[PDB]
Amino acid sequence: EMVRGQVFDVGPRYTNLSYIGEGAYGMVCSAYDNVNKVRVAIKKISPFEHQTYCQRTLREIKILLRFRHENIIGINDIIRAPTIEQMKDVYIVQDLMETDLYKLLKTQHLSNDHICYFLYQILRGLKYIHSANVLHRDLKPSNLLLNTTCDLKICDFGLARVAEYVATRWYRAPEIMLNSKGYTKSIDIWSVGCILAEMLSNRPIFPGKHYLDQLNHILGILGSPSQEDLNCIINLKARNYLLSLPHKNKVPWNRLFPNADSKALDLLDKMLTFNPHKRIEVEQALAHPYLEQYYDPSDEPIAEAPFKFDMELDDLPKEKLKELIFEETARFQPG
Ligand SMILES: c1cncc(-c2c[nH]c3ncc(-c4cn[nH]c4)nc23)c1
Numbered sequence: 001e002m003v004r005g006q007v008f009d010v011g012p013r014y015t016n017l018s019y020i021g022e023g024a025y026g027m028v029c030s031a032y033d034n035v036n037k038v039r040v041a042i043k044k045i046s047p048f049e050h051q052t053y054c055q056r057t058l059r060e061i062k063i064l065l066r067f068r069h070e071n072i073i074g075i076n077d078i079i080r081a082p083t084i085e086q087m088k089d090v091y092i093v094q095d096l097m098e099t100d101l102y103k104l105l106k107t108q109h110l111s112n113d114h115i116c117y118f119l120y121q122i123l124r125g126l127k128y129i130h131s132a133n134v135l136h137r138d139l140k141p142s143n144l145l146l147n148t149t150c151d152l153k154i155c156d157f158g159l160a161r162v163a164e165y166v167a168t169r170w171y172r173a174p175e176i177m178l179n180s181k182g183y184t185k186s187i188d189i190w191s192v193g194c195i196l197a198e199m200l201s202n203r204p205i206f207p208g209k210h211y212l213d214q215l216n217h218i219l220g221i222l223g224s225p226s227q228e229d230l231n232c233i234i235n236l237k238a239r240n241y242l243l244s245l246p247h248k249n250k251v252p253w254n255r256l257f258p259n260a261d262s263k264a265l266d267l268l269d270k271m272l273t274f275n276p277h278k279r280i281e282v283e284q285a286l287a288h289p290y291l292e293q294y295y296d297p298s299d300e301p302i303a304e305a306p307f308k309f310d311m312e313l314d315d316l317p318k319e320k321l322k323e324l325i326f327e328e329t330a331r332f333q334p335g
Helices: 051-066 101-107 112-131 186-201 211-222 236-244 262-271 282-286 318-328
Strands: 014-021 027-033 038-045 077-079 090-095 144-146 152-154
Touching: 014 038, 051 090, 051 318, 101 144, 101 186, 112 144, 112 152, 112 186, 112 262, 112 282, 186 262, 186 282, 211 236, 262 282
Parallel strands: none
Antiparallel strands: 014 027, 027 038, 038 090, 077 090, 144 152
């Protein structure tokens, strides 16, 4: 009934609730599933007052129900009020993972073997997403769930789009910088690159007090971009800043990561290129020598049918969004 003083009405199927995490994606608890005799994850969402949350909620539900892949979190069950009027909250039931990459990298050290396997699962999952004509747009360590068996799943597709206020900027590609457009598939690639770098050193590769500071860190490592690579268009200010800077020298990757696999550093390099047009794509990344021990196209499935929202969710008012959410969740009701 209650968790930390907040209502969490998911019984009678789900009991023994234990609080695990808050977030912009809702309140997350673990719980014992009486039916499947296993502990699960349940996410409570209360999105119906803000058109934004209703969008994020609908995208998440719709995406994860259509998606089916080993390295992508699924939805076991959705609990909500039997009538649309009473529906204030929505509980999404998902597989309970032991941790996320953010919590792991905070305190634990990864060997190359783990890093290589984690990265493989990331890209394998990302290939499926991209084949679905979908951008994740928010890849970060906290969105990568893990088991002790080292199985990994990508989660939180609340900000996904078909191929604005920002929280964390550490994993955003330089071209999106400031509050700009999440446009190409290459932005996810950049995010994976940043995630790889963090796996190698247990620290954010590109931190910054503001986006100019962040950009400076990026040039501090990659070095000054060529005029051709200076396709920073989505801001006069950001572009004029870069043009003013003195030349900056590229730091050799092995100088930053002296204990890293050379192949890992080579692939890291192709992911973290300033020019998005020059970045390696997911299928070519899976075919990189660093991942050759796991590489197998026949075992790297694509989406059975690409995505295309039948209506512009941004244009829909919150009341109709609520209707579509109600309809989408119907199949988890009796009948
Ligand atoms: C969307 C957003 N946030 C968490 C989830 C999630 C589903 N199943 C899970 N299982 C374990 C965890 C976890 C987090 N931190 N430590 C463990 N999260 C989830 C989905």
